[PDB]
Structure formats: C-alpha cells, structure tokens
C-alpha cells in the first residue's frame, strides 16, 4: 500500500508529462494531419488540496520536436514544430 506521505508528495501540483493533442495547441492547422497526432509535454498537473486554489505554471519554456505533417493531395514530410513546456508550477488562488 502507498504511504500517505508518498501519495501526498507524488500528486501535489507540479510539471508532469502530459500527452497533448497537436491540433489543440495549433487550432489553426485545420487541414493538416500529424504523426504523431499528440506529443509528450511537461505540463502543470496535480492537486492543491484547496478548493480555492489551482495549479498553474510560473515558469514556462519551449520544446522542439520532429512532427510529420500531411496535407492530403498536397504533400507529406517530417520537420520541426515547437511546443510549450511548463517548468514551474504553483498553487494560486482562482
């Protein structure tokens, strides 16, 4: 069984690998298909154990990955796309 201290530390507001959907971040890429369609990004996740608080990023950054783009009938290739990672997270009022 997981000790309260661990359960507590492990779920407390912090940057955790999140599988983020690309069309999500780039809502403008309507006509593109990506492979992968989602990327592994550091993102603020966890709890504050306070109804009035919320986990938010205090320090952001950018990560660049090779994403294959595909525009049906037009072209297909891999290349570089950049995404926002969260480096610091903090519980702040809402």
């Amino acid at each position: 069984v997981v000790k309260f201290m661990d359960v507590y530390q492990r779920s407390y507001c912090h940057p955790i690998e999140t599988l983020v959907d690309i069309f999500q971040e780039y809502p403008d890429e309507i006509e593109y298909i990506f492979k992968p369609s989602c990327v592994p990004l550091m993102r603020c996740g966890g709890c504050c154990n306070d109804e009035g608080l919320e986990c938010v990023p205090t320090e952001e950054s950018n990560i660049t990955m090779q994403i294959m783009r595909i525009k049906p009938h037009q072209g297909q290739h891999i290349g570089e796309m950049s995404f926002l990672q969260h480096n610091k997270c903090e519980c702040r009022p809402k």
């Epitope: 593109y32 294959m68 595909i70 009938h73 037009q74 297909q76 290739h77 891999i78 290349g79």
Partner: antibody
Amino acid sequence: EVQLVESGGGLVQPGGSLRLSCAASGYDFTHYGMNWVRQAPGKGLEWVGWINTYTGEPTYAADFKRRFTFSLDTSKSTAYLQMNSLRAEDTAVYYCAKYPYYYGTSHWYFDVWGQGTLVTVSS
Amino acid sequence: DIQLTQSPSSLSASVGDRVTITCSASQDISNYLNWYQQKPGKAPKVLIYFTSSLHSGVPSRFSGSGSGTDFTLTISSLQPEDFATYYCQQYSTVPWTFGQGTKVEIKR
C-alpha cells in the same frame, strides 16, 4: 548522404508500357513524399504528381491519372512510376524528387532529385 | 491550373551585372512561389522557396521577392557559373505548375 537513383528508362514502342524505379537512400523513405516531374527534350518542367510514402496514397496531375500509376515498396525504399499506352509526346527525362524537411510550417518545393532517365517512345 | 509566365524568356548579361527575372501568376497565389536553377544535363535545384527564403547552401547573391500575382528573382552580381535556365513554381493549388523558364547567358 541523401540520394535518389532512378532506373528503368530507355526505348519503348508507341502503345507500350514501362516501369521506372526511384531508389532512395541516406534517409527514411517513408518520411517524405515522392514527386515525379518530367521534361521533354529542350522543353520545360511538368509535375506529374506525388505519392504519400507513409500511407501509400497517390495524387496525379489530371492528364496523368489515366495512363500513369505511382507505387512503392517501402521494404526497398523505392517508388515506382508505371506508364501505359505511351505516345511520342511522353518522350522525356523523368525525375523523382522528395519533399523537404520543414521548419515550423510546410512549403511544397522539391529539394533532392534523382538524376533523371530518358524514356524515348518510338518504333 | 494556375499559369506561371516568366519574363524575359532569355537574356544575356555581363559578369557583375544585376539580373532580375519575373514570374507572373494567372491568379493570386500568396507567397507560394519557389525558384529553381537548372544547369545543362542536371536536375533543377531549388534556389528560393516561399517567395524569399534562401535555401541553405545558396549564394546570397540570389534573392526573391514579390507577392500576389507578381514575383521576382534577382541575382545581385552575375557570376560565370550562373549560366542556367531559371524556373518559378507555384504550390498554391494542385497541380503544382512551373513557369516556362528563363535562360540566362553570360556576355563576355
């Protein structure tokens, strides 16, 4: 180093068929689409179409869907262009050319080309 | 099919001269135009894409500009090795199309 090596060109009788191969090397064949361009002797460049090497889907410029067919054998990193019912006007140097690695956004230009092979249709 | 018309069709200029070649599209194509240099017996080689991005490895004397339906390729200082035929290519709407080519000859 990236390179495209085409073969299968040559003499063909009017009405005949011919298959050209484009052999890729020095990169991952399935990560970039393959285009086909032809240039009649002393003339301009004409885009024939392209094929998605990840999914297999071919897209042809209108005048070619009828007699030409694009295919691939990813296991050999090779794209093929099958031509049927050739006529004298099909006489040309045929090139295969891969799409480029992009930065942030996509631009459909051909960055590496094969050396081209002359297909001459005649009896 | 979008029609690309270049001009002039050919030209002769001296080493050191500034050469400008023109591409005119039959309809707006935004900045979706590329330029290629083709030397005798070789495949065309991309000089510029997206109207003005200089492809890596291409001498900076080559430059491109324009938009809408009018574009321009410029060689600031013609070198002996710039003898070739230059083509523009739109990627606005399939099928991709090319201009008829401009042959550039060196005058000496």
